Design a protein around this ligand. Structure first.
Ligand SMILES: [Mg+2]
Ligand SMILES: [Mg+2]
Ligand SMILES: [Mg+2]
Length: 287
């Protein structure tokens, strides 16, 4: 494509053409662009030394690490911020009005969410995107505070999705490194929740398998330290944990596998909880 889309209808038609070309669902690709678009806003938030203020996290980070086909499909945009929330929101809302390649975003008010082990309760808000004056997509956003050394470093991942529909701007998203993604997700999947609510995070089992695959050999001492840091800082269940399965997880885990038949994952919730438990033990042996 020679030029960027002239309007929203063009972008929608340019995307559905690229979606069928790459063998993915249009809605999945459309949310990817929007997710990519907010990342660009978040990337422009910086401190006095040029280092980023936000680090994307969770499902959006694994999508950028393995692409659309090899990553679980989720809608949340998770971020860890090195500054306080209303300063983050003002900066995000400031970057939205300015724009990026014709994309403008207005954000909703941040709302504190119930969190058991964080002295600074993360916040949740949404960005209503538009492309040249026409509403394009709404992305749920989540921002949480720093934890030990989880924002000390960052990976810079990229995606070519917008380069396909004629928006050639270079995408570079700062991401939380995998050792801390393993620690946070390990602590979440083995979390015992107070009576009212139950831990439904069977999907984290799938991701921990993906993150283990991305780590390859490398060295698990960084991952072990991150787990030692996260489990202690939250001061709930200790380390190492036991990957317990709950009665309603078999179907939730099967839903988390949708679209990952080509991948070498455990196809059942038990074998997955066993693989993640082997991975936990493998982390705990480090020297
Ligand atoms: Mg949890
Ligand atoms: Mg593995
Ligand atoms: Mg079980």
């Amino acid at each position: 494509y020679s030029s960027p889309p002239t309007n929203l209808r063009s972008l929608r038609d340019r995307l559905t053409q690229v979606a069928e070309r790459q063998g993915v669902v249009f809605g999945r690709l459309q949310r990817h662009v929007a997710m990519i678009v907010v990342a660009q806003f978040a990337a422009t938030l910086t401190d006095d030394t040029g280092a980023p203020l936000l680090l994307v996290k969770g499902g959006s980070s694994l999508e950028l690490r393995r692409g659309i086909p090899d990553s679980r499909t989720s809608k949340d945009f998770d971020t860890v911020a090195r500054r306080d929330i209303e300063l983050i929101h003002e900066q995000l809302a400031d970057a939205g009005e300015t724009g990026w390649e014709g994309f403008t975003a207005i954000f909703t008010a941040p709302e504190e969410i119930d969190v058991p082990g964080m002295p600074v309760k993360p916040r949740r808000f949404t960005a209503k995107l538009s492309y040249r004056g026409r509403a394009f997509a709404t992305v749920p956003i989540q921002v949480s505070s720093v934890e030990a050394g989880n924002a000390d470093q960052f990976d810079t991942l990229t995606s070519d999705a917008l380069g396909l529909v004629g928006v050639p701007a270079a995408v570079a998203v700062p991401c939380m490194t995998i050792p801390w993604q393993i620690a946070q997700k390990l602590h979440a999947v083995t979390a015992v929740l107070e009576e009212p609510k139950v831990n439904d995070r069977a999907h984290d089992l799938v991701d921990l398998q993906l993150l283990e695959g991305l780590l390859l050999d490398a060295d698990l001492m960084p991952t072990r330290s991150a787990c030692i840091a996260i489990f202690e800082a939250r001061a709930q269940h200790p380390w190492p944990p036991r990957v317990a399965t709950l009665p309603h997880w078999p179907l939730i885990y099967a839903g988390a596998l949708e679209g990952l038949d080509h991948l070498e994952l455990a196809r059942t919730v038990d074998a997955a909880a066993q693989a993640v438990q082997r991975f936990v033990a493998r982390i705990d042996r480090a020297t």
